Design a protein around this ligand. Structure first.
Ligand SMILES: O=c1ccn([C@@H]2O[C@H](COP(=O)(O)OP(=O)(O)O)[C@@H](O)[C@H]2O)c(=O)[nH]1
Lengths: 456, 432
């Protein structure tokens, strides 16, 4: 028997990557997978990732979701990805006929965590087990559930101090300074979407998280015991979700550069796939990389959408400054195979924004991290990484999007990262604890095993 | 629902490759697959292949076949690959306990054509549909089925149902040798094909003309198993590397201006022919990629050509736009690889069924094959004669156009509503 599972995709490599990786896992665990795509993807990368998955996995059916015509002026925000989310959510009543067509009949529908509010009702109509695929950390998933209860308690949500805390069941309380800055702005489309999603998690049959038990410090089994005792869906840890084989082009220019570098001497720098630093911050970060006295691999973005980042790096910095930096380190404004770079033995550290997928890839390859939160769940994530002993988080730098960090300071913190032996040691340990979880008898592999057996 | 299919592997790199590719094809068509391996493999090429297959398809389970101790003294040959077959065949009854323990329940067993007679009774024991994965062409396949009837009865000719009759000159050289352990198998196997539920051939309808439906009509009347066309068998994802030492050389060459010369893993050219073949390439005045299997001009030969003496990725070299022609021994695996990539080929049959396949290639219009050269193992070809024929291959435009035509017919056969996919769907649907 092969349980037919449907994956409902949203938008962004942050969400798309763990969805595709999970699709590949399901397929390799004797399930039938059908992914529900929507075009045109905001970013070119999304399009390529899907074409590469379908090419490698012909046994994966693709049904295209056709959204309703959308007027972006009806939405609060100018963010392309958020806008796309809203388009898909507004087309929710159209998913019902589409699912009925699919044969053989489904056994479970795995929804992206940004669409839960709108599509959990749909799945209920067809008596379909629905599972939330949470793309971030467990502590982040727990704040999302609690945040509706929080704002309801406040008469005036404007006169709220940064010092105030939001208590999370089973986790260390979260300071409002760590809460996504946009949350303080209720009525923003992002906030309204996450308030409604967090209220609907309880309607799902389970919550899938890209994590493993050892990472969380063993607080998870207790939490699930309390959650079950209150009629709440269980936290299902199936991570680390293994990077697919189509993510390893062994002849990349940056990969070839790395082969000519000493072991553990290269600092890899990336701030994700949907965010770009300001002009001033980009200039300062360039300065700080030279000051670090470290070999570095730097992935620059000047705009959120890769499709629109047409300007050359010469324009922002100047050929003078740019040519100078290319002497001390490798700089590239393109899409790089991040997981392929992280596994390379030349890479000794990672300067990241705290995006969960990145952090989990660094856990998987055992690379120390310097987390520099820019927005969203990255501060909550920063703390989780720090408590795992894998990364360091400079709290003095605040949010990246609202505070400028000058070059001199960046250089000194990167030096500390390249010589932080407790981080290196913990990495090796946490890495081996990661492999064990996906091996047979592993904690993660075990949970996925009971999932499929209930499908079935 | 997922049909559980078991693949029975034998030794030989020529038989292994289509076996491993068909295994992947089944997985990609929603089947659970289990392969039966025997170790130690005769070559590292087999071990490497199976390991890379199990590496890229974790869902494919491997249950090893342990065999009875074999006395190589009772052999009628000294070939390592054929010897392994006899070693496997004599321990055939050892497969019933292994096959019954497999979970979930099997719904079909696929056997290599070298093990058909010994292992098709095993299937009957277990109420399992057995299928024969034939590793050569349809024409060669029909010869094997009717050859036992023929010997129960040179310029002579053998009657083949469905095809043009085959001259005995095209029949494998060791078929005329009944003492040989090889011939004894082929005699025993051919008579046993009738017991199997179907014969899987790496081919598509358009390549053989519309004859397969017509043949299967007659085959159904006699109660004979149907000819299942499922080809071409595409190379797996482990059979492609972004860069190779040859490929890097190919990216500096003009389009279609390079001759690829390969004679397979098993066979090796004579020392005498290598010098002759070497001089013919230089005489051809064409850029060439030469594979040598087992020296003052050795450096001067690299002037307009590239030489490598190791395992190469043909499917990579053949897709490449710099390659315009193929000098092949005529193996059906390499031939389909050239069909799929639409590369014109010059067939130079060395042994086995390569003369038979050569007639299949010529009839299709994809290649030319020099009758005057005969068998490669038997007959030597001088340098001046080789170089001349290569130029004919590199200057033949009807060939290049036929290649383009066949390539689309081949590609259309895999896609939905295609020839080969239709038979495959109906096959799996029967299992169900
Ligand atoms: O240049 C890049 C940028 C992104 N990524 C991949 O894109 C994902 C981004 O996920 P993340 O957790 O950082 O969330 P984001 O903030 O980017 O949406 C990661 O898995 C990276 O491997 C990549 O491979 N190369």
């Amino acid at each position: 028997s092969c349980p037919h599972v449907a994956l409902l995709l949203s938008s962004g490599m942050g969400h798309l990557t763990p969805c595709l990786r999970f699709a590949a896992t399901l397929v390799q665990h004797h399930c039938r997978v059908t992914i529900i795509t929507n075009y045109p993807t905001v970013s070119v990368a999304e399009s390529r990732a899907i074409s590469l998955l379908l090419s490698d996995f012909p046994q994966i059916t693709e049904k295209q979701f056709h959204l309703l015509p959308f007027d972006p002026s009806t939405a609060n925000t100018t963010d392309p990805f958020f806008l796309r989310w809203e388009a898909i959510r507004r087309s929710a009543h159209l998913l019902n006929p589409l699912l009925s067509s699919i044969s053989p009949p489904l056994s479970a529908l795995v929804i992206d965590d940004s669409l839960v509010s709108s599509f959990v009702p749909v799945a209920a109509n067809l008596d379909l087990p629905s599972y939330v695929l949470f793309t971030s950390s467990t502590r982040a998933c727990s704040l999302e559930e609690t945040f509706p209860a929080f704002v309801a308690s406040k008469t005036n949500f404007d006169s709220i101090q940064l010092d105030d805390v939001i208590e999370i069941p089973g986790f260390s309380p979260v300071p409002v300074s760590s809460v996504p800055p946009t949350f303080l702005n209720l009525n923003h489309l992002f906030t309204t979407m996450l308030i409604q999603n967090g209220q609907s998690f309880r309607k799902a049959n389970g919550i899938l998280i890209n994590t493993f038990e050892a990472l969380e410090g063993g607080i998870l089994p207790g939490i699930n015991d309390k959650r079950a005792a209150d009629g709440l869906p269980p936290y299902c840890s199936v991570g680390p979700l293994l990077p697919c084989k189509f993510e390893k082009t062994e002849c990349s220019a940056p990969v070839k550069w790395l082969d000519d570098q000493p072991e553990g001497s290269v600092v890899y720098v990336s701030f994700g796939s949907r965010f770009a630093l300001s002009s001033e911050q980009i200039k300062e970060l360039g300065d700080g990389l030279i000051r670090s006295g470290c070999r570095f691999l730097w992935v620059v973005k000047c705009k959120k959408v890769d499709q629109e980042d047409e300007e050359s790096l010469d324009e922002l910095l100047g050929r003078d400054v740019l040519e100078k930096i290319k002497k001390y380190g490798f700089v590239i404004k393109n899409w790089v195979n991040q997981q392929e770079i992280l596994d390379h033995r030349a890479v000794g550290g990672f300067v990241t924004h705290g995006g969960w997928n990145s952090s989990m890839e660094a856990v998987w390859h055992g690379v120390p991290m310097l987390v520099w939160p820019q927005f969203g769940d990255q501060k909550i994530n920063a703390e989780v990484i720090e408590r795992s002993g894998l990364g360091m988080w400079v709290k003095r730098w605040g949010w990246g999007t609202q505070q400028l960090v000058k070059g001199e300071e960046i250089g000194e913190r990167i030096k500390d990262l390249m010589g932080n032996n407790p981080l290196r040691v913990r990495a090796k340990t946490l890495r081996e604890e990661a492999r064990k979880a996906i091996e047979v008898g592993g904690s993660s592999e075990k949970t996925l095993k009971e999932l499929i057996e209930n499908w079935k």
